[PDB]
Scaffold this active site. Structure first.
Site, mmCIF file in Angstrom:
data_model
loop_
_atom_site.group_PDB
_atom_site.id
_atom_site.type_symbol
_atom_site.label_atom_id
_atom_site.label_comp_id
_atom_site.label_asym_id
_atom_site.label_seq_id
_atom_site.Cartn_x
_atom_site.Cartn_y
_atom_site.Cartn_z
ATOM 1 N N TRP A 333 124.090 20.879 67.793
ATOM 2 C CA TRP A 333 123.577 19.512 67.861
ATOM 3 C C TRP A 333 124.255 18.652 68.927
ATOM 4 O O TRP A 333 124.695 17.532 68.651
ATOM 5 C CB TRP A 333 123.697 18.826 66.498
ATOM 6 N N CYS A 418 123.005 14.291 65.654
ATOM 7 C CA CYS A 418 122.410 15.468 65.028
ATOM 8 C C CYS A 418 120.913 15.592 65.288
ATOM 9 O O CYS A 418 120.512 15.960 66.380
ATOM 10 C CB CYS A 418 122.663 15.475 63.510
ATOM 11 N N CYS A 419 120.093 15.280 64.290
ATOM 12 C CA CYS A 419 118.647 15.388 64.435
ATOM 13 C C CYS A 419 117.892 14.077 64.599
ATOM 14 O O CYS A 419 117.141 13.897 65.557
ATOM 15 C CB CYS A 419 118.034 16.113 63.233
ATOM 16 N N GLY A 734 114.419 19.687 63.451
ATOM 17 C CA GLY A 734 114.946 18.464 64.029
ATOM 18 C C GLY A 734 116.002 18.845 65.054
ATOM 19 O O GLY A 734 116.805 18.018 65.501
#
EC number: 2.3.1.54
Lengths: 759, 759
Positions: A333, A418-419, A734
């Site tokens: 990520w 992250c997503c 994601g």
């Protein structure tokens, strides 16, 4: 006189602003970046050094995918910012330098999080942990893992085992923290250290006056540890022959300096997600200047970006098999937020915006960095089309609604962690919390708290629903109560978790790149929203009858009739999903949290859709036991059949106002579904997104969208012939993943998901 | 309601009470001890095993005194409860077993407190610290020392350097904690672990409900660490062949079990004072029973006590030269509270009370344990006389007013920590604070905060008195303002100190032997009370001429006329002292403290009377620069000239109601001053104390009294001929010391102190 001699030399030609008198990266960008509305016409190709370097690295990547294991990793060294010597791929070829360890892809040991996980990895990959390291981190230095399990309740332990609350950050770095790495390029370490020293001194008064005594002492020590970390950053760089005490002088140094800041972080912390931030436009300021002075060519510009992005493709962390099934595809990520629009109406898109996406061509498809386009209807069409083009060619990009978040924050310098978790860089962080199993929570409501697979009391003891035919109102009422219980256990687990992480694994090097006071949210996640919503729809629109065993436990369900499933733009069922999101948020919202983190929610799952799925029995919606839930907020596999526009409309209806931590949606669409040629596809893809993200006063709109343009047939082929798609990349929840890095079972999930055939 | 067999067996013959259903050592004592009012007539002499063992140990003691250095100590091992193997003096001879390390008198490394002090010791005693140990405790495991100096203010640092606030627990264990070691003998480890597990669970509700979230999480983890410590205690014992999971079965095990509890403590914590508690009477219950059953002889009883007391004479800790001058004589403070009276009127004196004092004869004079007689006018005269006798023969005992403290606590099971700090065993502790330089605080008042020696601005910058003659009211006013400043800096330093100690050096093994919730006081000490009080007398009953320098900085004072001095029963000098004690207390009393420790005060100094003395310039009272202050609350050397009754009356006037942490007083008297023969001396000594401790509704009375019966000539002789008094012991500040263990300078102090020549 906040204009030293180097400061002035380094900032020669830069427009003035408060940014020269205080730490304000946003202001600097505002007064100096140059908007770009042109096309890709200028992009250069890869240099021979790049290709040589990348190909060498791919050899290690193929080994990883093939063996589903680390190429190598430490066994006797405790990783620190300064613990390792400089490592290279080929020192004579790299324009940007820096590796976590002394060798490409060799993973380190970050013991502060816990020693048990390191042992698990050693055992799984057939390696022996150095006995001294084991002794040190079990008897002398207490770890985060030890601290959490020393304070956990047996209830939480049961929830962990039964599969209702599993995968929380109690056995790996919490992450969800993005240090403003741009700060080191802009001001230099020394300037940042003086700033921290000032912050440190500003707390003395309160301390002496007993004002918030304990909170003040904590912050003081944290800032001290931050100051100490900045100094280590310098030593780290020095090992590479660089002096980063002063500000970055040119483009090359701006990039190197910023990466050096991030390197210290990935050398000292385990974070599940170690995002990069919003740096492409920022770096463009230095690239433009060097270009205009004819100090650097355009192809030399790409090379630098390529070598930066290449290192981001090389970040690795030692993880256990348990972690691998919770977060599949060896994810990191290293998220980059590109484009967007400023508050003053101009686009934040720059030439560097294109240079970044161009790494996908220059070096092929890649899962990392996780390049995220901050979408806006007002973006220069040239850019909209090119992004879509890259999505069509690689399926490596994701899109988030800038028209929604920018206004919500009333800030144009926020990034994505992250997503889908937004934060204003250097001023805000999230207290990570994986996700709870909402589906299993409904079953507990129907079975009086007894888990349907283990058959033991987990939730509050209560009477199981008796009818021979389920009834909506009654089932909703018991679920509402069980959701109260879930919320209390969840917040309780996170409270102890983040208390221990602050204590045993404070991310000093990252916090050093934040303001003195940082906004904190308690991000709670929801898994199986669609199986939960449909299950209710089935119950509220059809006739669902429980099939019970000798003890009365509902082990299955028979359905008579059809009911509206989520993702077909049908209010009957969609309104139920919107409602669930609302209920849970209003519940976790009433609980006290550690360090007053503002409770937040997200409809994100990562590979928890698989792990929770196999630990959940048959459900009312019809899903069989052990079946994966849908990724994030996605409709259950194959249930969204009214084409794209429909499924997109259903998801966009999900209330970001109650899921401030993000709402993930993975969109897979077949090539011809978008058009007969790329020009049509590019235009149609863009069109789809403008509709999905369309933000109005009475139309919140969608928040996120993964874009996969492919044919299920191609994946089937890949499964059979790995060696034929070394760089095949796909969006899965994601974030991106190299198809070959997944397990059989995980690939099984992917291929069974919905492949939109029409619009 | 059947008692687990193991309990019922070990408890055969014991009287019933709540103590069998809950942890209540006080109740057990109350329902089982047998009061004794007889005399020493029964005491037995040393066995051959005892004498052989002791003499062997004395050889090591002579080496220590001679070299003023450790006999030996660890260099590469981090001490823990289970880190060392069993060590003995002579395994075939010891009735009670247990050493801190694997060898008699070899000192260990307790790194958790800080690595710098360990390096200092290694450097001072010519030894090399293992590099791995150094690396571990500087980069991996943060220490108490590191945490404190990361949060200290530059003001506190200046106070530390100037000598106004020096020697605080920031570079050594805080101590002042007494675990109820009797608990392990009474209940066994297993029973105590079940009790802790219950305590742990009792916090779950609050946790889940967000009630005092952070305080609850902290306590939970502490109790967990406590539980884990109890288990280690078992392993520790096992290495010695003992199973202490169950309760003590006989006298021998009661003693061994209790010592084993204390051993774990001195194997894991650095505490300046690691007191034993109030155990003699408690142990008598087991001795009586075994005696009555003819299982043990009386001489066998003494042997056991002797071997217990002998181990207490062998407790050692690695200290730095800096520490040696702050706490002289290689002190440990293994304090034992003997005798006293119960709330029900009967005496807590027992045969074991005599057995303990008898170790002074059985094994000669010894500084440790620090045997403290809880004095009461109602004590059996037989005991009063014998104690006095031991004082006359050894000068190894101290006396505290039981008639005062017992009622104040309304508890008859309180003990004395270190020198004079009282606490109800297992239910209360203290946050140790060294002592502040009250004297130097007065000089700062007269010199506007500028240090009269370093000429730097330490206190708050203000205007110094301009008078050619010092005027009381004016000086005081300032003094008051400065005392406010002292109080704020002092509390602030302790707040950060105890915050860090709880964080990096929580005394798990000792707290494991306390109730779930423990009362905590913030004990602050005042040094140089007498130099401060007298100084005021001079300015108020004479003519003080401030001999200034080229900056106006008062570096001396001329005195015209005699003036009242503390310790001669003159209410004009005595009333100043009493007033000072009051002012400071009412000040520190208004400040917020860490974990809400109730601020307390003590007039105690230890060797700080020497360290602060040499760092303080000429004072108004007439004391020259560099001269030692008086120990504790003692009149300045030689100023108390109206005999004993006078000096005792002056000190007794000091308000224990404002010095709840104790008021230390070293009283030394010449043999003939007490009588022509011992019978007269014994009777007169006792009489003196009954007067001094006399407690009435309108007469608070004295709190403490060290008793030295000797001739200055004898000390002079000792100085010249060390080898002639290997065991010579003397009271020096609220604890004992072997004369030969002191430095030249420290001995210099001792010999110049007041030697009462008459009553």
């Amino acid at each position: 006189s906040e204009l030293n001699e180097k400061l002035a030399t380094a900032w020669e030609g830069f427009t003035k602003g408060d940014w020269q008198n205080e730490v304000n990266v946003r202001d600097f960008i505002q007064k100096n970046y140059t908007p770009y509305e042109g096309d890709e016409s200028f992009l250069a190709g890869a240099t021979e050094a790049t290709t040589t370097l990348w190909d060498k690295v791919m050899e290690g990547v193929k080994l990883e995918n093939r063996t589903h294991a680390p190429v190598d990793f430490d066994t006797a060294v405790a990783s620190t910012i300064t613990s390792h010597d400089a490592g290279y791929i080929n020192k004579q070829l790299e324009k940007i330098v820096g590796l976590q360890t002394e060798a490409p892809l060799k993973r380190a040991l970050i013991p502060f999080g816990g020693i048990k996980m390191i042992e698990g990895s050693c055992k799984a990959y057939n390696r022996e942990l150095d006995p001294m390291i084991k002794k040190i981190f079990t008897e002398y230095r207490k770890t985060h893992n030890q601290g959490v399990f020393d304070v956990y309740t047996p209830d939480i332990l049961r929830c962990r085992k039964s599969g209702v609350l599993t995968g929380l950050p109690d056995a790996y770095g919490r992450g969800r923290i993005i240090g403003d790495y741009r700060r080191v390029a802009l001001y230099g370490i020394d300037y940042l250290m003086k700033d921290k020293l000032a912050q440190f001194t500003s707390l003395q008064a309160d301390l002496e006056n007993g004002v918030n005594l304990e909170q003040t002492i904590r912050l003081r020590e944290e800032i001290a540890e931050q100051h100490r970390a900045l100094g280590q950053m310098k030593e780290m760089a020095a090992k590479y022959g660089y002096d980063i005490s002063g500000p970055a002088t040119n483009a090359q140094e701006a990039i190197q300096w910023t990466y050096f800041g991030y390197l210290a972080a990935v050398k000292s912390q385990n974070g599940a997600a170690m995002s990069f931030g919003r740096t492409s436009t920022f770096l463009d300021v230095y690239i433009e200047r060097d270009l205009k002075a004819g100090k650097i060519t355009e192809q030399e510009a790409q090379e630098m970006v390529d070598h930066l992005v290449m290192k981001l493709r090389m970040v690795r962390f030692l993880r256990t098999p348990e972690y691998d099934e919770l977060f599949s595809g060896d994810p990191i990520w290293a998220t980059e937020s590109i484009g967007g629009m400023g508050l003053d109406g101009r686009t934040l898109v720059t030439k560097n915006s294109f240079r970044f996406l161009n790494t996908l061509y220059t070096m092929g498809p890649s899962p990392e960095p996780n390049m995220t386009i901050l979408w806006s209807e007002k973006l220069p069409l040239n850019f909209k089309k090119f992004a879509a083009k890259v999505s069509i060619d690689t399926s490596s990009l994701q899109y988030e609604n800038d028209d929604l978040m920018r206004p919500d924050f009333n800030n144009d310098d926020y990034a994505i962690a992250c997503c889908v978790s937004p934060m204003i860089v250097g001023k805000q962080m999230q207290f990570f919390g994986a996700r709870a199993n909402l589906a299993k929570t409904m079953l507990y409501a129907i079975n009086g708290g007894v888990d349907e697979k283990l058959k033991m009391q987990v939730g509050p003891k209560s009477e199981p629903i008796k009818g021979d035919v389920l009834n909506y109102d009654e089932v909703m009422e018991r679920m509402d109560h069980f959701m109260d219980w879930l919320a209390k256990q969840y917040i309780t687990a996170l409270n102890i978790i983040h208390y221990m992480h602050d204590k045993y694994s404070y991310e000093a090097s990252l916090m050093a790149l934040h303001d003195r006071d940082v906004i904190r949210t308690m991000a709670c996640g929801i898994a199986g929203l669609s199986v939960a919503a449909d299950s209710l729809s089935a119950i509220k629109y059809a006739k669902v009858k429980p099939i019970r065993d000798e003890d009365g436990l509902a082990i299955d369900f028979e359905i008579e009739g059809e009911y509206p499933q989520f993702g077909n733009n049908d209010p009957r069922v969609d309104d139920l999903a919107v409602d669930l999101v609302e209920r849970f948020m209003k519940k976790i919202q009433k609980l006290h949290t550690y360090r007053d983190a503002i409770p937040t929610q997200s409809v994100l799952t990562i590979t928890s859709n698989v792990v929770y799925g196999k630990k959940t029995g048959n459900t009312p919606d019809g899903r069989r036991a052990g079946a994966p839930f849908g990724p994030g907020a996605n409709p259950m596999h194959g249930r969204d059949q009214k084409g794209a526009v429909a499924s997109l409309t259903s998801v966009a209806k999900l209330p970001f106002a109650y899921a401030k931590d993000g709402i993930s949606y993975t969109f897979s669409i077949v090539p011809n579904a978008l058009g007969k040629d790329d020009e049509v596809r590019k235009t149609n893809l863009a069109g789809l997104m403008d509709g999905y993200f369309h933000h109005e006063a009475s139309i919140e709109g969608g928040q996120h969208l993964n874009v996969n343009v492919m044919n299920r047939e191609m994946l089937l082929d890949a499964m059979e012939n790995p060696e034929k798609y070394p760089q095949l990349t796909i969006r899965v929840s994601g974030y991106a993943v190299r198809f070959n890095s997944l397990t059989k079972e995980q690939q099984q999930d992917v291929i069974t998901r919905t492949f939109t055939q029409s619009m």
